Amino acid sequence: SLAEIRTDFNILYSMMKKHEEFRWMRLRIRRMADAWIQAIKSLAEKQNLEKRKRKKVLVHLGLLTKESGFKIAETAFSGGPLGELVQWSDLITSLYLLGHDIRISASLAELKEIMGGGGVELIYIDIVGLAQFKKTLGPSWVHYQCMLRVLDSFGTEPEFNHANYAQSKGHKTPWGKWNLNPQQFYTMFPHTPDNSFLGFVVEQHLNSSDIHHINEIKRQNQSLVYGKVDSFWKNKKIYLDIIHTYMEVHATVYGTKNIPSYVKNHGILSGRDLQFLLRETKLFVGLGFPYEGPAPLEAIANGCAFLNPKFNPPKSSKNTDFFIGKPTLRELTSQHPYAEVFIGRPHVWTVDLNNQEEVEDAVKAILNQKIEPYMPYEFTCEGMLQRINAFIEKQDFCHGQVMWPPLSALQVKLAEPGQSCKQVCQESQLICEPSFFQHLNKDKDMLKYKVTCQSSELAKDILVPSFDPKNKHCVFQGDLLLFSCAGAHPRHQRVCPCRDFIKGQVALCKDCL
């Protein structure tokens, strides 16, 4: 009944052989196996993994069901989308190494059998899979809703999750409306503090001697374009011509008349051959699309600089077809906001693609830069293992455990008008902690944080609790499902729950382990 760390992948390989659909994830795990095993042993030596209850975990890969009809396994080796399979691979591996009892499903039949078998304590599922869960189980699916952890790359904001409020606000999207605790949504990058950051591991294969003699390994004038689809290259000729002035321009593109004649195409590469190419490459070139993928972090892990297209105005539902109907109003300041804000120079140059001088200076700067391979701790094997272990042991929506994060981590901030709780926490080098809103939502609570309510009313709005400092009037939350880090009050101040984070591990407060 106690979890024991696993240091051998034989049982896992055996589980993943039972579906052809898993082939790409099995090959990824096999390439990263030595790094994973080093990591679970290191975590267990540093940090108490003893006396954890072994959980029966349902892992339902909705994106791999026939019923979903996505053909993601079918395109996995021919340049189709891999972001979601990267994350699923690293989640399954983490659960397995931590010694949990994983039951993998990629069919309605398996979903129903596993849930039928009882004893399920935890459910990892995607958005397509969640619809299938509700349909397969029927009305008692809600009996399990607190055990759901919903892999949702781009995030779901409270205003979209609340079905009745989303309708009241005229949101016409099919997405959202699950009425979950929004911390139950597991994102690819830590961009949505209303949600939990799951992430993944950045694959690299530089041994200690590679990292040291990286200046001698790298072709100093080799650039590689990020963009495995020809359409991504539309209207990039002037940009690429500026880079071609200084560097060879390599590509990994399928099929192409958006691609200048001078570009050295390798076509779609296997994982190992891509990694070898990144090891050789000085500059990884963003075209603007796709948004918030793993590929740039792979380049940075291999000592490549990332040229990150800046978006002014920021891209969102208000101006970008891709974002219309997504259950979020979040704006992207660049192709890879994580790379921009949490890594930055010298590894990431965030440049206006249109500004020829800024692009030319970035390329010339990057050529003159010393290579330092870098991975943020949260995207290492040991980082992800620490994060998902903390979530499994500590994160409880079923009212069975102590409060987490602990109240001790609460730092109240007042957001100005036009400023969200996400923004005011961030610019204090903190992060919004939506589990703390419940402590900021009445007169006697506001006194503790030096806010004085002469008058107060209740509103069912994402923008409250709010404070008019001019009138000393407080608006409190009437619908607890509408507590939201996202959203700026145009008139009043927001009362905002912030927490600290372990540096390089934003998911976790300093006292959260």
Ligand X SMILES: O=c1ccn([C@@H]2O[C@H](COP(=O)(O)OP(=O)(O)O)[C@@H](O)[C@H]2O)c(=O)[nH]1
Strands 264-265 and 248-251: parallel
Our CB check for ligand X shows the closer of 86 and 304 to be 86
Dihedral sign, Cα of residue 60, residue 23, residue 225, residue 358: positive
240 binds ligand NAG (CB under 6 A): no
Helices 356-367 and 237-244, packing angle to 10 deg? 30
Say if CB 378 and CB 337 are below 8 A apart.
Answer: no
Give the whole-angstrom CA distance, residue 273 versus residue 442.
Answer: 58
Give the whole-angstrom CA distance, residue 296 versus residue 302.
Answer: 10
215 binds ligand NAG (CB under 6 A): no
The single residue listed with the structure tokens 């979601």 is 84
Our CB check for ligand NAG shows the closer of 333 and 369 to be 369
**Residue from 47, 168, 221, 235 binding ligand NAG (CB under 6 A):** 221
3-state secondary structure of 425: helix
Is position 153 annotated in a ligand binding site? yes
Binders of ligand X: how many residues, by CB under 6 A?
A: 15
Amino acid at 398: C
Residue 504: CB minimum distance to ligand X, A: 21
Contacting ligand NAG within 246-265 (CB under 6 A): 246-248
Is position 326 annotated in a ligand binding site? yes
Tokens of 205: 């294969």
Our CB check for ligand NAG shows the closer of 3 and 363 to be 363
Give the whole-angstrom CA distance, residue 80 versus residue 252.
Answer: 12
Amino acid at 338: Y
81 binds ligand X (CB under 6 A): yes
269 binds ligand X (CB under 6 A): yes
Q: Which of 259, 239, 263 is nearest to 250 (CA)?
A: 263
Our CB check for ligand X shows the closer of 299 and 440 to be 299
Amino acid at 60: H
Residue 248 contact among ligand X, ligand NAG, none, beta carbon within 5 to 8 Å by kind? ligand NAG
Residue 92 contact among ligand NAG, ligand X, none, beta carbon within 5 to 8 Å by kind? none
Helices 127-137 and 108-116, packing angle to 10 deg? 60
Residue 220: CB minimum distance to ligand NAG, A: 7
3-state secondary structure of 483: coil
487 binds ligand X (CB under 6 A): no
Q: Which of 476, 237, 246, 273 is nearest to 354 (CA)?
A: 237
Residue 269: CB minimum distance to ligand X, A: 4
Give the whole-angstrom CA distance, residue 452 versus residue 397.
Answer: 32
Helix (H) or strand (E) segment spanning residue 358: helix 356-367
Residue 219: CB minimum distance to ligand NAG, A: 7
Is position 340 annotated in a ligand binding site? no
Give the whole-angstrom CA distance, residue 99 versus residue 129.
Answer: 24
Say if CB 352 and CB 205 are below 8 A apart.
Answer: no
319 binds ligand NAG (CB under 6 A): no
Binding track over 228-257 against ligand X, x by CB under 6 A: x-----------------------x-----
337 binds ligand X (CB under 6 A): no
Is position 317 annotated in a ligand binding site? no
Residue 12: CB minimum distance to ligand X, A: 20
Residue 221 contact among ligand NAG, ligand X, none, beta carbon within 5 to 8 Å by kind? ligand NAG
**Residue from 263, 274, 362, 371 binding ligand X (CB under 6 A):** 274
Binding residues for UDP-N-acetyl-alpha-D-glucosamine: 298
Which residues of this protein are in contact with ligand X, per CB under 6 A? 81-83, 86, 228, 252, 268-269, 271, 274, 290, 293-295, 298
Which residues of this protein are in contact with ligand NAG, per CB under 6 A? 221, 246-248
Binding residues: 152-153, 298, 326
